[PDB]
Scaffold this active site. Structure first.
Site, PDB file in Angstrom:
ATOM      1  N   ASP A   1     -14.624  30.200 -21.180  1.00  0.00           N
ATOM      2  CA  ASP A   1     -16.042  30.119 -21.478  1.00  0.00           C
ATOM      3  C   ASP A   1     -16.564  28.681 -21.398  1.00  0.00           C
ATOM      4  OD1 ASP A   1     -18.582  31.251 -22.773  1.00  0.00           O
ATOM      5  OD2 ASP A   1     -18.042  29.781 -24.245  1.00  0.00           O
TER       6      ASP A   1
ATOM      7  N   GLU B   1     -15.608  29.873 -16.259  1.00  0.00           N
ATOM      8  CA  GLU B   1     -17.036  30.121 -16.093  1.00  0.00           C
ATOM      9  C   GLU B   1     -17.764  28.818 -15.795  1.00  0.00           C
ATOM     10  OE1 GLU B   1     -19.722  30.027 -19.082  1.00  0.00           O
ATOM     11  OE2 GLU B   1     -21.181  31.416 -18.234  1.00  0.00           O
TER      12      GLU B   1
HETATM   13  C1  LIG Z   1     -25.514  31.289 -21.105  1.00  0.00           C
HETATM   14  C2  LIG Z   1     -24.957  30.126 -20.279  1.00  0.00           C
HETATM   15  O1  LIG Z   1     -25.737  28.941 -20.542  1.00  0.00           O
HETATM   16  C3  LIG Z   1     -25.437  27.860 -19.634  1.00  0.00           C
HETATM   17  O2  LIG Z   1     -25.872  27.998 -18.372  1.00  0.00           O
HETATM   18  C4  LIG Z   1     -26.835  27.202 -17.699  1.00  0.00           C
HETATM   19  C5  LIG Z   1     -26.258  26.705 -16.369  1.00  0.00           C
HETATM   20  O3  LIG Z   1     -25.067  25.967 -16.568  1.00  0.00           O
HETATM   21  C6  LIG Z   1     -27.309  25.909 -15.578  1.00  0.00           C
HETATM   22  O4  LIG Z   1     -26.847  25.651 -14.268  1.00  0.00           O
HETATM   23  C7  LIG Z   1     -28.641  26.670 -15.497  1.00  0.00           C
HETATM   24  O5  LIG Z   1     -28.541  27.788 -14.626  1.00  0.00           O
HETATM   25  O6  LIG Z   1     -29.054  27.102 -16.782  1.00  0.00           O
HETATM   26  C8  LIG Z   1     -28.131  27.979 -17.408  1.00  0.00           C
HETATM   27  C9  LIG Z   1     -28.796  28.608 -18.636  1.00  0.00           C
HETATM   28  O7  LIG Z   1     -28.927  27.654 -19.669  1.00  0.00           O
HETATM   29  C10 LIG Z   1     -23.980  27.431 -19.785  1.00  0.00           C
HETATM   30  O8  LIG Z   1     -23.687  26.410 -18.839  1.00  0.00           O
HETATM   31  C11 LIG Z   1     -23.029  28.627 -19.644  1.00  0.00           C
HETATM   32  O9  LIG Z   1     -21.703  28.212 -19.947  1.00  0.00           O
HETATM   33  C12 LIG Z   1     -23.487  29.765 -20.576  1.00  0.00           C
HETATM   34  N1  LIG Z   1     -22.573  30.906 -20.549  1.00  0.00           N
HETATM   35  C13 LIG Z   1     -21.737  31.158 -21.487  1.00  0.00           C
HETATM   36  C14 LIG Z   1     -21.584  30.273 -22.708  1.00  0.00           C
HETATM   37  C15 LIG Z   1     -21.936  30.710 -23.940  1.00  0.00           C
HETATM   38  C16 LIG Z   1     -21.712  29.791 -25.109  1.00  0.00           C
HETATM   39  O10 LIG Z   1     -20.403  30.136 -25.549  1.00  0.00           O
HETATM   40  C17 LIG Z   1     -22.475  32.093 -24.241  1.00  0.00           C
HETATM   41  O11 LIG Z   1     -23.758  31.968 -24.852  1.00  0.00           O
HETATM   42  C18 LIG Z   1     -22.552  32.971 -22.983  1.00  0.00           C
HETATM   43  O12 LIG Z   1     -22.566  34.369 -23.298  1.00  0.00           O
HETATM   44  C19 LIG Z   1     -21.412  32.555 -22.040  1.00  0.00           C
HETATM   45  O13 LIG Z   1     -21.182  33.470 -20.987  1.00  0.00           O
HETATM   46 CL   LIG Z   2     -18.314  35.004 -16.599  1.00  0.00          CL
END
Ligand SMILES: C[C@H]1O[C@H](O[C@H]2[C@H](O)[C@@H](O)[C@@H](O)O[C@@H]2CO)[C@H](O)[C@@H](O)[C@@H]1N[C@H]1C=C(CO)[C@@H](O)[C@H](O)[C@H]1O
Ligand SMILES: [Cl-]
Ligand SMILES: OC[C@H]1O[C@H](O)[C@H](O)[C@@H](O)[C@@H]1O
Ligand SMILES: [Ca+2]
EC number: 3.2.1.1
Length: 496
Positions: free
Chosen positions: A197, A233
């Site tokens: 994550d 991720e």
């Molecule tokens: C939910 C997601 O937020 C972040 O993503 C950002 C991207 O990195 C950017 O490039 C742009 O597209 O904006 C996005 C939205 O803010 C983050 O980087 C990811 O890691 C994140 N996903 C996960 C992390 C979490 C925190 O533990 C959870 O909320 C989520 O369910 C995860 O899958």
């Molecule tokens: Cl994922």
């Protein structure tokens, strides 16, 4: 870290999102094993904040309180039970590893946690780990807010708080060791690998230092020297200083370009057409196939979170969704992950789903069991896409054609396409506004084949469409644009 560690001839993992351990254990035995599924990505198995406003949201599981295996999905006994029972039937478990951060900096102190452990975000005290103020990046982060403000700055993306989530000091050997302890606990139980994550929010070098401390996989189930499958991720659609390739040293990486582009194509948005999929994969600017973890939707973007945008296809758009998932599972690019979801009361207010936070089906916060309806679908608002005949049968299609080359491509210059995988499978799509009726080279041996989209082979006959391949490998296909499933797939194991 690159090998899935699934059984030979099993090629997909399914995300059983928010499922309880006892339900997954049964699912492995009654369904995943006999249907040839490689494995299950589970929701974070470690203790999290019990968030009561809003009421027990999906996202509470991404706010760790400790590494105790104690969640709404179940306790450590149930977790151990699930991994054992799944491994015993040749189905793997992959853990969603939340290791970048603890909970939100503004969550109240107390025991509002899934195992009742005490924690104090304000003083940075998580004594069930234990972590203290020394274990977070407060002093390392250089932004005014202490949170990530600017993705153009690779440093703050790593050292600052994602949405105020307390950012662990992963540069420290103590912190690395506490995380490695958690992951080794999981590995010894029999976990086959990890979804890492928030990987973008960690230095590739810190992830590496954590992975350096990990055991080989449990030697009762896995060959000596087996390393945990790692998929990280990282949302990288381009235009950011951090790139998916920065993480190749640690394992595979989620290719979020995959589902974004495929959704656009299948929706026929932005002038895109299925005929353009002829060079799908690296020809579309995607990462190397041997590093890609691919999927149509994930637990975030199916509800508009993370990346995604409007093009993402989900169970809500069942007809186009099945086609997109069918295409993915037929095409050799990447390692495939199938989503499995729950229904939530989706409700839009000015283009926003105000209920995108809603957690799994529950009675006063207690996760509902997965009930199996007579026809093998699920009750209790579990969608169970992995049990939809069209998806489950495409999961086996991928197994059957494993290692066979992309071949015998056809297109009509628009949205009627077909292709084969060696001499083992063939698939045909009609995404145009007229009937697709044509005799096509299938690359397959002569015979009668059950279309595994419309039906199944049950010794000697088909429950759906039958396709007739003559001696020169050619077969007639007729797919109306009004077809509820406007695609057909046949393979070596669907031959009568
Ligand atoms: C939910 C997601 O937020 C972040 O993503 C950002 C991207 O990195 C950017 O490039 C742009 O597209 O904006 C996005 C939205 O803010 C983050 O980087 C990811 O890691 C994140 N996903 C996960 C992390 C979490 C925190 O533990 C959870 O909320 C989520 O369910 C995860 O899958
Ligand atoms: Cl994922
Ligand atoms: O519509 C744009 C497409 O047109 C062309 O046919 C090319 O094959 C493809 O690469 C391009 O993206
Ligand atoms: Ca970080």
């Amino acid at each position: 870290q690159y090998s899935s560690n699934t059984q030979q001839g099993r090629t997909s993992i399914v995300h059983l999102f928010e499922w309880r351990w006892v339900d997954i254990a049964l699912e492995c035995e009654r369904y995943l094993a006999p249907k040839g599924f490689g494995g299950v990505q589970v929701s974070p198995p470690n203790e999290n904040v019990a968030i009561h406003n809003p009421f027990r949201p999906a996202w509470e599981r991404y706010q760790p309180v400790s590494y105790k295996l104690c969640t709404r999905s179940g306790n450590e006994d149930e977790f151990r039970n699930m991994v054992t029972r799944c491994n015993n039937v040749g189905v793997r478990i992959y853990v969603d590893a939340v290791i970048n951060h603890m909970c939100g900096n503004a969550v109240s102190a107390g025991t509002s946690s899934t195992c009742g452990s005490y924690f104090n975000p304000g003083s940075r005290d998580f004594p069930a780990v234990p972590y203290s103020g020394w274990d977070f990046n407060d002093g390392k982060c250089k932004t005014g807010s202490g949170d990530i403000e600017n993705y153009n700055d690779a440093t703050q993306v790593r050292d600052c708080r994602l949405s105020g989530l307390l950012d662990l000091a992963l540069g420290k050997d103590y912190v690395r060791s506490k995380i490695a302890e958690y992951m080794n606990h999981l590995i010894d139980i029999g976990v086959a690998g990890f979804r890492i994550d928030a990987s973008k929010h960690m230095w590739p070098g810190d992830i590496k230092a954590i992975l350096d401390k990990l055991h080989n996989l449990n030697s009762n189930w896995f060959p000596e020297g087996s390393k945990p499958f790692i998929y990280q991720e990282v949302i990288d659609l381009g235009g950011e200083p951090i790139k998916s390739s920065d993480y190749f040293g640690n394992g595979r990486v989620t290719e979020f370009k995959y589902g974004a582009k495929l959704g656009t194509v299948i929706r026929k948005w932005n002038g895109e057409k299925m005929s353009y999929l002829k060079n799908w994969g690296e020809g579309w600017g995607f990462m190397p196939s041997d590093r890609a973890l691919v999927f149509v939707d994930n637990h975030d973007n199916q509800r508009g979170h993370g990346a995604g945008g409007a093009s993402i296809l989900t169970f809500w758009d069942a007809r186009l969704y099945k086609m997109a998932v069918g295409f993915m599972l037929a095409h050799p690019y990447g390692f495939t992950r199938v989503m499995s979801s729950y229904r939530w009361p989706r409700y839009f207010e000015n283009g926003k789903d105000v209920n995108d936070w809603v957690g799994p089906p529950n009675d006063n916060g207690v996760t509902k069991e997965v009930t199996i309806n007579p026809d093998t679908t699920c009750g209790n608002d579990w969608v169970c896409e992995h049990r939809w005949r069209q998806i489950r049968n495409m999961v086996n299609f991928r197994n059957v054609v494993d290692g066979q080359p992309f071949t015998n491509w056809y297109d009509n210059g628009s949205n009627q396409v077909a292709f084969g995988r060696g001499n083992r499978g063939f698939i045909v799509f009609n995404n145009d506004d007229w009937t697709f009726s044509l005799t096509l080279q299938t690359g397959l041996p002569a015979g009668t084949y059950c279309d595994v989209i419309s039906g199944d082979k049950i010794n000697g006959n088909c429950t759906g469409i039958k396709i007739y391949v003559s001696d020169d490998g050619k077969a007639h296909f007729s797919i109306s644009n009004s077809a509820e499933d406007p695609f057909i797939a046949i393979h070596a194991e669907s031959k009568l």
